[PDB]
Each structure stands twice: as C-alpha cells, then as structure tokens.
C-alpha cells in the first residue's frame, strides 16, 4: 500500500524516459484490459506449472523429513534467492559473506 | 404557392398580410458539399461576389449554407417586385459579374469570414466536428471554406461552378412576406435567365464515429460537443429528433432560470456547477445528420464529470423519460420551429432549403400536426434506434485535458 501511494503521488515512468503529462490515458478502458493480458499469460503458465510439473522448481530433498543428524549432499535455498546464496559463499568470512 | 416558370425554374412563396418586411431571394444549391479540398469555398465566394452587386436600396445578402447556397434581397413589402428583378439580373448576369470581378477583395473577406468562424469557439468546435464526423467526404468541407484554400480560387474556378450549378433544375426562388404572388412570378419570368441543365448529383456522405481535439491551453474554457447520426430533413423522424434533442434542452449557467429549466441534466450539473453552458440541438442536412449537444465547461477540472453525466442523460432516452419530458419537448420544439419561421428571411431561407433539399415543405400547422403525433415510447423507440448505443463524434478546443479519450465517452452511450 506505501508503494503504490508513493507511485500515485509521481505516477508512473515510461519506457522513452521523458514525461508522460503530455499523453496520459485513464486506466479503465486502457491498461486494465492489458492487464487482463498479463494476468491470464501469468494464470497459464502458472497452470502449466502448478498442474504439470509442480515440483520442478522445487528441491527433491524437501520431501525428506528433516534429520538433524543427516546432513544431505549439499544445501541450496529455493531457488529465487541462489543469486545471494552465491554472493555469501564469495565471502570467506562469514560476518564478511 | 409553387409556380414552376419558363425554363422551369421553381417560385416558391408564403405570402402572409402581418409580414413587417418582404424577401426573395434565388437560391443554387451546391454548398460546400458539391465542393472538393482543392476548390472548397468557391461557392461561398461566388455566392459573395453576386451579393455584392449594386442592391438598388434593397438588402441583397449571401446565404452561403452547407448544402445550398443563394443571394436574397430583404426589402419593404411594397418594393419587392423591384427586388425580384434585381435577384433576377443578378443572377441571369452571373457569368458576366464573375467574369468583371477582381476576386481579391471578396477573396479576402471571405478569408475574413473562415477565420471568424475559426476563432468563435462554438462556431469552430461545431466545423471540426462536422469535419470529422463525415470525414472522407465533400459534406465534410467548411461552409466558408478554409483559408488555405479561399486565396488559391480564381475566376474560371467561380465560372465552372456557376455553370454547373447555377441551371433551371438546380435553382428556386423563394420568397415571403405581403405581396400577390403572381405579381412577383410575373416581375422575375420577365427577367430570369439562366442555363439550362441537370440537377447536379448530391454527393454521397456517411457518418464515421471519430474524435478530433484542437487542445489550446490559453483558452478559459472548454468548448466541446457530442454528437450522433442525426436525421436528415426526408427522415420521417425528423421532428421526432428535434424533440429528443429538446427533451435535454438548453442550459445557461448564470441564467436566472439557470436554477429552474426544467431538464434533468440542468438540475445535475448545477450542484456542483459543472458546467458553464450547453445546448442540445438536431442539425439536419439534406439526408443525414448530427444529434448531440455543444457545452462550454469553465472549470477545466469537470469535463469529465459533464461529459459522463451528459451521456448518462442520454442513457435515459431509451428507458426513463416521462411523459412530462416528452409534453415540454413537443411544445419546445414548436414554439422553436414557429420562432424559427417569424422573421422573413428567415421564412425565405427556410422555403429554399426545403424546396432544394426535400422538394416539398410542410407548412407550420402540419409540422405542428405531425409532432403532437409523438408519444413517449415513440422517443424511446428514436433513442434505442439512433441514441443508444450509436456510435459518438466528438470535438473539444480547449482546457480539454479532462476530457477522457473515446473509448470512456463511447461506453458511456450503453451503462444502463
Ligand atoms: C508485491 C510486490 C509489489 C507490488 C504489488 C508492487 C506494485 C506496483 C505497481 C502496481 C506498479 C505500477 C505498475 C508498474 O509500474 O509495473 C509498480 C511499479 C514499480 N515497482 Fe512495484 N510493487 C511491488 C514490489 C516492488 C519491488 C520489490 C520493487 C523494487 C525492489 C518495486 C519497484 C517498483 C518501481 C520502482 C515501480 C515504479 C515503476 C515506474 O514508475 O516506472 N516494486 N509497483
């Protein structure tokens, strides 16, 4: 809700950059249809993860109850935040990663 | 009264003793709708040049409509025989007047004229949308033509439009006023001559949903106006649009009965004073036409809000209106048509267009006849056929940022 009050109080940029005050469209007829687009593409594909293949994005070793006293092979977050998980492992010191 | 002449030409008059003043006047046809862009405005300045002719005390005047166009000559009653033959000369000298012309000085004020009518806010946001509306076609041409067109037009441009244009079957001469009839049929048969000729085919027009937006900011208001396909003057629902444009009616903010006219619209837009001024009206051409309001919005913050409440009114034309919306707009509407047809010339213009135009004229009391005729589900039958749901033309000069683009207007026309 603040991000969208701090976007409603400058509006929104444009992919030219320049200001858009000079060409400016209502939202209901325009962009809410074209919103629709994008929430029915993410709805598909969303569908042909959540039904076919579901567990793709996920860890198999999820679906081993937890044992403190196994460690598995080797330990990996999901997978949206690897990116930070590398950049901690960059860093020898932990404090420092 | 009708009598068709030697050479066929047609006399048209409605003579009646209370007439303070007399008219006749010939009148060709051919207006800005028989033009093309390149020579658009001819016949307003041929129009021009006849009536610039020595007038022999009388009033001779240029019509210069849409569709047709015609030189008349307001004068006393007593002297409008003398009046007939001078229209008559001026017209079976046309060719000879044009030839004898130097077109600069008319050229520059009817340049003066297209620049008038280019600057009135009402008179220029009504132009762009006509324009737009019948966009792709000679009815969409200025009557006055446009200044970048009138300065490129030469004699032999006015020459080839009066012989085309100007022949028996393609010109009337109507009058009105206190004088016998044949007195004056008389006076003219003995002095009109002009060349024979086919009624030139009326070019073809159709109505484009469209939006056009001169935004000029340093304007003070908004002069914007909404509009439909109307009813031409041979749709028999004529006078049933006229009573659906009245049923909305006109509204003047600072008015005294401002606070009291009896429109829905009139009472919703002056609880916040949305808007400064409106007016609804049925311009109605020789077959096609424009239905729709013009409306001039001081605050630039509500075009928006008049614009929405404005087509919702409408929305109320095919369901809600009441037999009390419809009893005013009837009796509105032939107290206009019986205003229109006081004033002479007046009288006299309105016998040409329709005699040109439809061919026949009916009288005031068969008009006043045929609107009685309407009911209230009659209107609601008009609205659900041309109103609901029709597709709009828009037009807007300035402070016009708050006018939502087409599509929020368009919608509007079928919410409920
Ligand atoms: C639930 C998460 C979020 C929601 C619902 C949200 C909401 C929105 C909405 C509705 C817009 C306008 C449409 C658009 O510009 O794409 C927008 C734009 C934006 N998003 Fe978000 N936001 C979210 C998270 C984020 C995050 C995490 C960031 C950056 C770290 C971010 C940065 C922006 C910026 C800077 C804009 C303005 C874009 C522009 O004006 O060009 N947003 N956001």
Same mark, same amino acid.
């Given at each position: 809700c603040m991000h969208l009050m701090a976007l409603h109080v400058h509006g929104s940029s444009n992919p030219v950059g320049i200001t858009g005050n000079i060409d400016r469209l209502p939202m209901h007829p325009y962009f809410i249809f074209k919103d629709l687009i994008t929430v029915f593409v993410f709805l598909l594909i969303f569908s042909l993860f959540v039904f076919y293949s579901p567990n793709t994005l996920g860890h198999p070793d999820n679906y081993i109850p937890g044992n403190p006293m196994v460690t598995p092979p080797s330990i990996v977050p999901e997978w949206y935040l690897l990116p930070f998980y590398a950049i901690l492992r960059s860093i020898p010191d932990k404090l420092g990663g | 009264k009708y009598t068709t002449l030697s050479n066929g030409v047609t006399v048209a008059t409605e003579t009646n003793p209370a007439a303070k003043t007399s008219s006749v006047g010939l009148f060709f046809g051919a207006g800005s709708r028989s033009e093309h862009s390149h020579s658009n405005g001819i016949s307003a300045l041929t129009t021009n040049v006849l009536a610039s002719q020595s007038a022999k005390g009388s009033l001779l005047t240029a019509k210069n409509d849409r569709e047709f166009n015609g030189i008349i000559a307001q004068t006393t009653n007593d002297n409008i025989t003398e009046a007939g033959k001078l229209i008559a000369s001026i017209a079976s000298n046309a060719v000879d007047i044009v030839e004898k012309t130097d077109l600069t000085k008319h050229k520059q004020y009817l340049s003066a004229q297209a620049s008038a009518v280019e600057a009135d806010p009402k008179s220029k946001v009504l132009s762009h949308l006509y324009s737009s509306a019948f966009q792709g076609y000679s009815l969409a041409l200025p009557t006055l033509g446009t200044t970048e067109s009138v300065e490129n037009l030469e004699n032999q441009d006015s020459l080839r439009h009066l012989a085309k244009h100007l022949v028996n079957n393609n010109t009337v001469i109507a009058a009105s006023g206190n004088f016998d009839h044949d007195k004056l049929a008389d006076a003219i048969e003995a002095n009109l001559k002009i060349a024979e000729g086919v009624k030139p085919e009326i070019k073809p027009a159709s109505f484009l949903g469209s939006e056009v937006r001169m935004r000029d900011d340093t304007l003070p208001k908004a002069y914007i106006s909404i509009a439909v396909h109307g009813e031409g003057?041979?749709?028999?629902?004529? #006078?049933?649009?006229?009573?659906? /444009? !009245?049923? #909305?009616?006109?509204? #003047? @903010?600072?008015?005294?009965? /401002? *606070?009291?006219?009896?429109?829905?619209?009139? $009472?919703?837009?002056?609880?916040?004073?949305?808007?400064?001024?409106?007016?609804? #009206?049925?311009?109605?051409?020789?077959?096609?036409?424009?239905?729709?309001?013009?409306?001039?919005?001081?605050? *630039?913050?509500?075009?928006?809000?008049?614009?929405?409440?404005? @087509?919702?009114?409408?929305?109320?034309?095919?369901?809600?209106?009441?037999? /009390?919306?419809?009893?005013?707009?009837?009796?509105?509407?032939?107290? !206009?048509? !019986?205003?229109?047809?006081?004033?002479?010339?007046?009288?006299?213009?309105?016998? !040409?267009?329709?005699? @040109?135009?439809?061919?026949?004229?009916? $009288?005031?009391?068969?008009?006043?006849?045929?609107?009685?005729?309407?009911?209230?589900?009659?209107? *609601?039958?008009?609205?659900?056929?041309?109103?609901?749901?029709?597709?709009?033309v828009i037009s807007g000069t300035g402070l016009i940022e708050d006018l939502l683009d087409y599509n929020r207007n368009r919608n509007e026309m079928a919410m409920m």
């Amino acid at each position: 809700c603040m991000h969208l009050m701090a976007l409603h109080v400058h509006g929104s940029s444009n992919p030219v950059g320049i200001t858009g005050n000079i060409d400016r469209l209502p939202m209901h007829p325009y962009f809410i249809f074209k919103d629709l687009i994008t929430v029915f593409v993410f709805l598909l594909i969303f569908s042909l993860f959540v039904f076919y293949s579901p567990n793709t994005l996920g860890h198999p070793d999820n679906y081993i109850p937890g044992n403190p006293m196994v460690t598995p092979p080797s330990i990996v977050p999901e997978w949206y935040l690897l990116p930070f998980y590398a950049i901690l492992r960059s860093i020898p010191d932990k404090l420092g990663g | 009264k009708y009598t068709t002449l030697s050479n066929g030409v047609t006399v048209a008059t409605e003579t009646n003793p209370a007439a303070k003043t007399s008219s006749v006047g010939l009148f060709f046809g051919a207006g800005s709708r028989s033009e093309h862009s390149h020579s658009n405005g001819i016949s307003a300045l041929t129009t021009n040049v006849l009536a610039s002719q020595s007038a022999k005390g009388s009033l001779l005047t240029a019509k210069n409509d849409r569709e047709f166009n015609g030189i008349i000559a307001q004068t006393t009653n007593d002297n409008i025989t003398e009046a007939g033959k001078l229209i008559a000369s001026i017209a079976s000298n046309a060719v000879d007047i044009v030839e004898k012309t130097d077109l600069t000085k008319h050229k520059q004020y009817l340049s003066a004229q297209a620049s008038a009518v280019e600057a009135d806010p009402k008179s220029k946001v009504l132009s762009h949308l006509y324009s737009s509306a019948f966009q792709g076609y000679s009815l969409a041409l200025p009557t006055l033509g446009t200044t970048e067109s009138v300065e490129n037009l030469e004699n032999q441009d006015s020459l080839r439009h009066l012989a085309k244009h100007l022949v028996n079957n393609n010109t009337v001469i109507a009058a009105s006023g206190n004088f016998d009839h044949d007195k004056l049929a008389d006076a003219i048969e003995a002095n009109l001559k002009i060349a024979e000729g086919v009624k030139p085919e009326i070019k073809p027009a159709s109505f484009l949903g469209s939006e056009v937006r001169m935004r000029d900011d340093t304007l003070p208001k908004a002069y914007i106006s909404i509009a439909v396909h109307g009813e031409g003057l041979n749709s028999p629902n004529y #006078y049933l649009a006229k009573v659906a /444009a !009245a049923i #909305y009616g006109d509204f #003047y @903010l600072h008015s005294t009965i /401002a *606070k009291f006219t009896s429109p829905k619209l009139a $009472s919703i837009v002056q609880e916040y004073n949305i808007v400064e001024s409106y007016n609804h #009206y049925s311009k109605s051409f020789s077959d096609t036409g424009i239905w729709g309001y013009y409306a001039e919005i001081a605050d *630039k913050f509500t075009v928006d809000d008049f614009t929405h409440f404005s @087509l919702k009114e409408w929305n109320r034309l095919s369901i809600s209106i009441s037999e /009390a919306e419809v009893a005013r707009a009837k009796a509105q509407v032939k107290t !206009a048509l !019986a205003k229109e047809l006081a004033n002479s010339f007046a009288v006299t213009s309105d016998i !040409a267009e329709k005699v @040109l135009l439809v061919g026949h004229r009916q $009288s005031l009391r068969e008009a006043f006849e045929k609107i009685d005729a309407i009911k209230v589900n009659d209107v *609601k039958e008009w609205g659900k056929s041309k109103v609901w749901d029709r597709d709009i033309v828009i037009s807007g000069t300035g402070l016009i940022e708050d006018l939502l683009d087409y599509n929020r207007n368009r919608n509007e026309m079928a919410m409920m």
